[PDB]
């Protein structure tokens, strides 16, 4: 029998209240054997292939499409060619928030300096005892937690300078 | 969304067609059994490109030879695109027109001489003039090539089951028996 | 990187990863339907 | 490499590094004129000295392939290889 | 984007912990238009229609479908034409079990007597008034948490001997 709408914005609350031990992940510091196109993803991964670390994420929230003129005094974000609203736990099921929006930033090399081409969100993250940086090598974390989402891009590559920003937008049934 | 082609083919001596609806073996009994399914380490290691080379010996020169491969996009369509049609009498339209273009990898190395070569032919095919079109080539001394193309839109190819074939014809100068380092094999494309 | 001043102790660490087939479907089963049931015969560890 | 850098080929004996001495045994230039070319190790490129060198028995010498440039790319054997003219085939260890 | 299967295992180990809190509930007591063909049920509703009552979950637990040889000496169950066996929070992942087993039976008279048609189970459901029982009418709830999950039947009646047991397997994302 069917999960309902207002199940997938509990679940959605959920993952928002999971948010402290939230990570990006970055990884696959090699080619494809085609940089044009990366491969499409496997679910049933647990982390991602030639891991380069863990960033603290930035910013989880909630989101939903944005509907004007109702919303145009809320916080509008740009991605993935449309617009969107951040919605707040506590007005989730008033607003049918299922969607979250995942984003961290790494500034410069706070992660070792290359390319990546597998971006991903972890949550229940744990470092090694006493570590309190939000930057992470795989050697420096003790628990991985779960790897919840990834995706598969092309390279990017990092220098001091650039602020490599990733993110996501994702609903727990992205299907029904 | 990406678009490749990962995990049939048929080492032969033989001349052969299919029909516009041909089933995937129909190629082994047709051709008197005068060839052999390729080991089953084909569809397990060359369907990425690593290192475990499937490398595979050939007979040719009063015969011409073979490797035949299957495309059944119905394997494929079904399991990555379940919300697009696959059954509609013309669905082969969404098959080309969701495809787009396509294109080919395929990495492979002779091992004769630094300074001999043999001749490769990629052919597909169309179901128009009913041919395995000539459609590139590519020579090979010792060292490695990407010996695939860019080749255009597909519609032509379309077999009614949702699915190809296409093949590689071998010819080898003088030499009679060769081997081959074939590694992998894949076929480009993009949905968002 | 050495500093290039005073001594420097370079050496080695063997790498410890525990293998399943699970992340390893290379290797799972391919004598059959690959994680045809066999292929969880075995683990390793690896250390390069 | 070009007709203006070269090799230089000395021979010399060999050091309690295992590695060669530094003594000017025997010594030759060898510009990209000098040096004969083949994709499966045949062009046979002859090193001759000005007078010959006395190779004794019972001794390893060594080849010092003095140059400056990269570009000079010999034809080597390693443990186990496939062989240049016919990779088919693989060698020993040391080759020799 | 898109979730992965382990997301779902987790979600359910998730629902599973929630357990203590989840009630069969039953209601439409009066026709559909069509008795031997209801409506479709809609995900966006809160609340059963015609409320009979709600009944503690007998049973709750982390399942998947059984598969041979490996399940023949195990603790199968036999629900809807289909073999089932129990799973573990700590083993989810080593099983695949991202199916949960909801239960429970009003037996004869413990909820008012009569037809019913629709079957639904809740989550974070609180009584009035101190009340201890797991057999609750809708003037002995007092807030009815979140209905998670359920469906639409035909009829069927109750008598004093008749034990009506209602269950369901469901999983946090069914089709994806």
Do not use: C
Not at chain 1, 3 to 20: G, I, Q, W
Not at chain 2, 115 to 144: A, G, H, M, P
Not at chain 3, 29 to 42: I, L, N, R
Not at chain 4, 40 to 60: C, I, L, Q
């Amino acid at each position: 029998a069917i999960a309902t709408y207002n199940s997938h914005v509990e679940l959605a609350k959920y993952l928002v209240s999971k948010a402290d031990s939230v990570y990006l992940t970055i990884g696959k510091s090699t080619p494809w054997s085609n940089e044009t196109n990366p491969p499409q993803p496997d679910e049933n991964a647990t982390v991602l292939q030639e891991v380069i670390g863990y960033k603290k994420a930035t910013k989880v929230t909630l989101v939903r499409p944005s509907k004007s003129p109702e919303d145009d005094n809320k916080n509008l974000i740009s991605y993935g060619n449309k617009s969107w609203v951040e919605v707040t736990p506590e007005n989730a099921k008033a607003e049918g928030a299922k969607w979250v929006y995942l984003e961290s930033s790494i500034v410069g090399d706070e992660l070792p300096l290359g390319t990546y081409r597998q971006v991903g969100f972890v949550m229940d993250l744990v470092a090694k005892s006493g570590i309190s940086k939000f930057n992470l090598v795989p050697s420096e974390v003790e628990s991985t937690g779960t790897l919840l989402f990834f995706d598969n891009k092309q390279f990017q590559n990092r220098s001091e300078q650039t602020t490599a920003k990733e993110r996501f937008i994702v609903e727990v049934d992205p299907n029904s | 969304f990406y678009g490749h082609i990962n995990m049939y083919g048929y080492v032969t001596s033989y001349v052969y067609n299919p029909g516009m609806t041909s089933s995937v073996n129909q190629i082994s009994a047709s051709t008197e059994g005068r060839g052999q399914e390729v080991p089953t380490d084909y569809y397990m290691y060359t369907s990425t490109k690593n290192n475990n080379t499937v490398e595979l010996s050939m007979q040719t020169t009063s015969g011409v030879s073979y490797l035949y491969n299957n495309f059944n996009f119905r394997d494929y369509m079904s399991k990555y695109r379940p919300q697009v049609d696959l059954q509609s009498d013309e669905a082969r339209r969404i098959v080309s027109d969701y495809i787009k273009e396509l294109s080919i990898d395929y990495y492979l190395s002779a091992v004769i001489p630094p300074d001999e070569s043999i001749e490769i032919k990629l052919q597909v095919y169309d179901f128009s003039i009913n041919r395995w079109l000539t459609v590139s080539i590519n020579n090979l001394s010792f060292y490695e090539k990407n010996i695939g193309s860019n080749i255009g839109y597909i519609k032509d190819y379309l077999n009614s089951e949702l699915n190809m074939f296409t093949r590689l014809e071998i010819n080898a100068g003088k030499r009679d028996s060769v081997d081959i380092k074939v590694n992998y094999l894949d076929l480009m494309f993009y949905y968002y | 990187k050495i500093t290039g001043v005073g001594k420097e102790t370079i050496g080695i660490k063997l790498t410890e990863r525990i293998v399943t087939p699970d992340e390893d479907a290379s290797l799972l089963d391919q004598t059959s339907g690959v994680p045809s049931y066999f292929s969880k015969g075995a683990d390793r560890l690896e250390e390069k | 490499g070009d007709k203006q850098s070269n090799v230089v080929i000395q021979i010399r004996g060999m050091g309690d590094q295992g590695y060669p001495n530094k003594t000017i045994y025997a010594e030759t230039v060898m510009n990209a004129d000098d040096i004969k070319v083949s994709n499966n190790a045949s062009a046979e490129t002859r090193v001759y000295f000005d007078d010959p060198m006395m190779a004794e028995g019972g001794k390893e010498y060594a080849i010092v392939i003095i140059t400056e440039n990269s570009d000079y790319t010999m034809w080597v054997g390693t443990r186990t290889k496939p062989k240049i003219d016919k990779p088919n085939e693989v060698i020993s260890g040391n080759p020799y």
